[PDB]
């Protein structure tokens, strides 16, 4: 009912035990998220060898609103 101070948790053992094993899990999760290439697929960021398609040799252009989904699918090469 008094919202325990931060000093008490700092000296606690359960807090350190949980965090020393959980924070590295998040760090490795992010490292693997970027390394395995899942970031490119999820966020649509092209890989350094996919910026320019075989048929396209210039920056893409949407030039279409209600069919923008198909336009982006075609431009991205997928």
């Amino acid at each position: 009912p008094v919202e325990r101070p931060f000093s008490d948790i700092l000296t606690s053992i359960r807090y350190w035990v949980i965090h020393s094993i959980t924070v590295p899990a998040l760090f490795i999760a992010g490292w693997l998220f970027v390394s395995t290439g899942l970031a490119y697929d999820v966020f649509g960021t092209p890989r350094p060898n996919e910026y320019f398609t075989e048929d396209r040799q210039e920056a893409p252009l949407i030039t279409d609103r209600f069919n923008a989904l198909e336009q982006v699918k075609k431009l991205s090469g997928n």
């Binding site: 101070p5 931060f6 000093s7 948790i9 700092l10 350190w16 965090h19 020393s20 959980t22 924070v23 590295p24 760090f27 490795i28 490292w31 970027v34 390394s35 290439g37 490119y40 890989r47 350094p48 060898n49």
Partner: protein
């Protein structure tokens, strides 16, 4: 082609990141909070 070329540095950096983050997040919060207890502990509203 884009792919990480370092294998084991990930864990070594993660351990240090977590160890530093714990302390660095608990301490300033303590410093800011103690005055919050002082102010809201008898003279508030």
């Amino acid at each position: 082609r884009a792919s990480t070329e370092q294998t084991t540095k990930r864990a070594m950096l993660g351990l240090l990141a977590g160890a530093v983050a714990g302390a660095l997040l608990v301490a300033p919060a303590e410093a800011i909070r103690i005055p919050s207890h002082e102010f809201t502990g008898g003279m508030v509203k």
